[PDB]
């Protein structure tokens with residue numbers, strides 16, 4: 269296709285589809301009701317991302333937004349994907365540590381604010397205001413990272429050791445990979461425009477696959493997704 | 499009005515409103531907390547559909563999509579309706595058989611993918627890609643039908659006989675009526691264009707009323723929506 | 729800015745942000761899992777409203793709708809806010825009285841219909857049909873007010889006295905403040921156009937702050953959000 273970033277869109281589509289199929293086959297026959305929840309959540313994540321990468325590849329998930337005196341290609345389908353997948357990923361972590369309901373709602377709600385204000389910033393036509401929305405979205409992300417570190421890490425250690433070990437790995441993966449997102453947005457085509465769109469698409473593709481399929485490979489091999497039973 | 503399909507839009511509006519009012523009156527005074535859930539879910543279904551049929555009748559729920567070198571009328575409000583009503587209908591069936599939480603999330607999530615990719619296909623301006631989205635949506639539907647047949651039918655029979663009997667009827671109604679949807683889309687105005695819009699609207703109106711009000715009449719007369727009590 | 733209503737948008741933004749920060753600090757260290765739910769729900773409400781007032785202030789949340797032969801400024805972001813905040817506020821009340829699940833779903837679903845049909849009415853280009861949607865939305869509101877009065881008031885009194893006392897106050901605040909919304913819409917710029925936009929914005933700002941921050945100040949000072957414990 270005529271968009272140089274097409275190659276990373278095609279690769280992302282393929283890797284999300286492959287991950288979906290792997291998790292779907294691996295989940296076959298699992299009967300433990302706890303493991304069933306984790307397989308359900310964790311297979312839905314790359315299946316959603318598959319459909320939204322495909323929409324970017326085929327050009328449906330792309331729009332033009334006028335700012336800085338130019339017509340800037342903005343892939344809006346990223347936010348339609350992240351609105352559903354990022355809370356599912358926090359639900360995997362919260363169910364692992366058996367978080368209380370109030371904390372789960374705070375996490376999902378702040379996550380909604382993070383994605384929603386990112387979309388508004390991506391579509392805003394006054395250049396300087398784009399970064400106002402970026403800051404509010406980044407502040408919601410910091411709230412989430414704080415809860416994951418100074419709320420979840422304390423319940424985990426009071427839990428099954430294999431639960432504590434798998435949570436600490438997935439938490440560390442989550443904090444590292446999620447913190448890169450606001451940086452890429454800020455220096456790429458949605459923000460300051462220093463990194464061109466084709467490289468930004470590569471970077472997001474590496475992050476998206478790692479945070480969904482990589483995350484899922486660590487979780488679904490773990491013993492912590494099963495009840496303790498004889 | 500000047501659209502020949504208006505007559506089926508008006509009839510669908512009337513029948514969804516009548517069904518809503520019937521279920522609402524029938525549910526009055528019910529105090530069993532289990533029956534309350536089923537009345538809540540099952541009355542909300544035609545009330546949503548009422549509002550979205552009304553929006554198609556009045557022309558709000560209609561847009562023009564250019565493909566095949568023509569401006570094609572696409573009723574987008576069908577997908578805004580189905581996004582909310584189809585998971586509610588699966589929730590009626592899953593609560594009947596007391597499905598586990600993981601399975602419920604898999605069903606609702608695949609249902610979301612089915613409707614979401616149907617909307618993308620309905621709005622896509624490259625003709626051949628419309629059928630790519632149709633295929634992905636149909637594959638999510640098959641996943642749902644498989645779960646309903648080779649997961650739910652096995653828990654039901656281990657349940658109350660009246661639960662097993664009412665589930666098997668509603669399952670059979672669900673599988674038959676839901677399988678017709680991808681066929682109508684494919685041969686009507688969203689797809690190959692063999693059946694004209696006014697007949698497609700009739701067919702959908704027959705399906706929508708049967709799958710919501712007919713489904714609801716069978717369920718809410720049943721004894722399975724009540725706890726077993728003296 | 730050049731819109732005379734800007735001053736009430738700026739004041740609303742400031743008061744929602746201040747309320748969010750107050751509730752967030754006040755909630756720090758709370759460990760009771762019940763109180764955690766109420767703090768979670770009640771802090772998310774003004775945080776959402778903050779982001780949507782900011783979008784109206786900066787002009788993102790505004791669109792032009794042609795009706796009555798004019799281009800009418802319609803702030804659509806009000807409905808994106810209310811779609812999420814109004815069910816959260818009903819969830820605060822329902823958890824207080826420990827409502828059954830069926831009733832909670834009926835409330836949230838009717839609330840969804842109320843906001844959804846209000847948005848359709850706000851965006852409808854045939855003037856007389858705007859009031860059809862207003863009537864359907866008002867009928868869903870009456871259903872909600874009826875449940876709050878002839879379902880919730882009866883469970884409350886069978887509960888902890890401090891639960892019964894705090895619910896009755898918050899119910900009365902809710903019924904009074906929520907009933908004003910359909911009146912303002914009808915006589916302001918979305919409806920008959922008797923009250924100009926800058927005054928309508930003031931009225932909504934007074935209502936929104938009272939129904940969210942005022943509501944939240946009454947609830948989160950109360951003893952009813954905590955479990956009874958020694």
Ligand SMILES: CCCCCCCC/C=C/CCCCCCCC(=O)OC[C@H](O)CO
Pocket residue numbers: 467470474
């Ligand atoms: C897991 C095993 C695989 C590991 C792989 C990890 C890759 C992740 C990072 C990629 C950034 C690549 C950056 C490529 C930059 C090229 C941009 C370019 O062409 O810059 C010149 C410009 O045209 C004028 O200055």
Ligand SMILES: CCCCCCCC/C=C/CCCCCCCC(=O)OC[C@H](O)CO
Pocket residue numbers: 697700704
């Ligand atoms: C419950 C009791 C009621 C039962 C009712 C069940 C009806 C369901 C099916 C309807 C399809 C009707 C198809 C009508 C086809 C007419 C199309 C037509 O005019 O075709 C000629 C065309 O103009 C040139 O070939």
Ligand SMILES: CCCCCCCC/C=C/CCCCCCCC(=O)OC[C@H](O)CO
Pocket residue numbers: 927930934
């Ligand atoms: C909590 C302590 C503070 C209490 C505060 C409560 C205020 C709520 C009501 C405000 C309505 C104000 C209405 C202002 C009307 C002025 C409109 C105007 O200018 O009308 C003349 C017009 O130009 C030609 O007739």
Ligand SMILES: CCCCCCCC/C=C\CCCCCCCC(=O)OC[C@H](O)CO
Pocket residue numbers: 370371372374377378381404407408411745746748749751752755758763764765767768771772775778
């Ligand atoms: C000027 C001030 C502007 C306003 C600030 C920016 C608003 C958006 C940013 C972050 C969301 C903050 C988190 C919202 C959710 C709070 C959750 C909560 O309070 O949870 C308590 C519970 O006890 C825990 O387990």
Ligand SMILES: CCCCCCCC/C=C\CCCCCCCC(=O)OC[C@H](O)CO
Pocket residue numbers: 373376377378380381384385387388391776779780791808812
């Ligand atoms: C427990 C549930 C908690 C739920 C928490 C959710 C938080 C979402 C809050 C704010 C973002 C709203 C973003 C809305 C952006 C809409 C953009 C859009 O549709 O734009 C259309 C068009 O391009 C221009 O009019």
Ligand SMILES: CCCCCCCC/C=C\CCCCCCCC(=O)OC[C@H](O)CO
Pocket residue numbers: 406447448450451460462
């Ligand atoms: C825990 C994770 C926290 C995540 C949040 C971290 C945000 C701040 C980081 C970097 C901003 C660096 C400055 C970027 C702005 C550069 C502006 C500019 O014009 O730069 C010129 C350019 O370098 C040549 O042309």
Ligand SMILES: CCCCCCCC/C=C\CCCCCCCC(=O)OC[C@H](O)CO
Pocket residue numbers: 285286288289291292295298303304305307308311312315318600601602604607608611634637638641
């Ligand atoms: C090329 C490959 C493309 C990718 C395939 C097409 C994607 C969309 C289609 C179907 C959704 C499939 C179902 C998604 C949800 C899976 C649920 C699950 O795994 O549930 C396990 C649980 O144990 C059960 O009770």
Ligand SMILES: CCCCCCCC/C=C\CCCCCCCC(=O)OC[C@H](O)CO
Pocket residue numbers: 316319320331348352603606607608610611614615617618621
């Ligand atoms: C447990 C929760 C699970 C939730 C599972 C949800 C699955 C949805 C996934 C993909 C479809 C996304 C479809 C998005 C289509 C948007 C179309 C649109 O708004 O188009 C606007 C405009 O016409 C053009 O830019």
Ligand SMILES: CCCCCCCC/C=C\CCCCCCCC(=O)OC[C@H](O)CO
Pocket residue numbers: 636677678680681690692
């Ligand atoms: C369990 C339910 C499964 C649901 C999924 C079943 C999908 C396949 C079924 C029918 C496709 C039949 C072929 C349709 C394509 C016809 C193309 C065409 O141009 O036909 C010419 C026309 O007949 C004259 O002009």
Ligand SMILES: CCCCCCCC/C=C\CCCCCCCC(=O)OC[C@H](O)CO
Pocket residue numbers: 515516518519521522525528533534535537538541542545548830831832834837838841864867868871
């Ligand atoms: C012409 C007739 C048109 C149709 C009427 C207007 C439709 C929209 C208005 C109101 C929603 C009504 C409430 C919908 C939800 C009903 C909930 C229910 O039935 O709940 C039973 C449960 O037992 C309780 O706890």
Ligand SMILES: CCCCCCCC/C=C\CCCCCCCC(=O)OC[C@H](O)CO
Pocket residue numbers: 546549550561578582833836837838840841844845847848851
């Ligand atoms: C338990 C869950 C229950 C959930 C209950 C939800 C009830 C919502 C029902 C109907 C309103 C639908 C309103 C849809 C309005 C869309 C307006 C829009 O997006 O318009 C785009 C554009 O301006 C023009 O095409």
Ligand SMILES: CCCCCCCC/C=C\CCCCCCCC(=O)OC[C@H](O)CO
Pocket residue numbers: 866907908910911920922
């Ligand atoms: C419990 C809460 C219930 C909430 C629902 C209550 C709705 C009815 C109330 C008021 C309508 C009054 C009539 C408004 C219509 C006036 C039309 C008009 O043109 O008025 C001329 C104007 O007064 C000079 O120019």
Ligand SMILES: *C/C=C(C)/C=C/C=C(C)/C=C/C1=C(C)CCCC1(C)C
Pocket residue numbers: 350353354357382383385386387401402405406409446447449450453475476479480
């Ligand atoms: C599957 C992909 C994942 C894990 C998505 C993560 C997304 C974020 C952490 C995005 C955050 C953003 C900000 C904090 C600033 C504004 C732009 C966003 C939405 C990219």
Ligand SMILES: *C/C=C(C)/C=C/C=C(C)/C=C/C1=C(C)CCCC1(C)C
Pocket residue numbers: 580583584587612613615616617631632635636639676677679680683705706709710
């Ligand atoms: C109330 C109406 C009901 C039960 C709606 C059912 C809808 C479907 C089963 C739709 C499925 C579709 C496909 C599987 C292919 C693409 C087009 C759709 C969305 C009609």
Ligand SMILES: *C/C=C(C)/C=C/C=C(C)/C=C/C1=C(C)CCCC1(C)C
Pocket residue numbers: 810813814817842843845846847861862865866869906907909910913935936939940
């Ligand atoms: C935070 C703000 C609150 C509590 C919002 C309340 C909103 C309503 C009660 C709105 C109801 C409406 C109608 C009943 C008629 C049509 C217009 C609406 C949506 C304003």
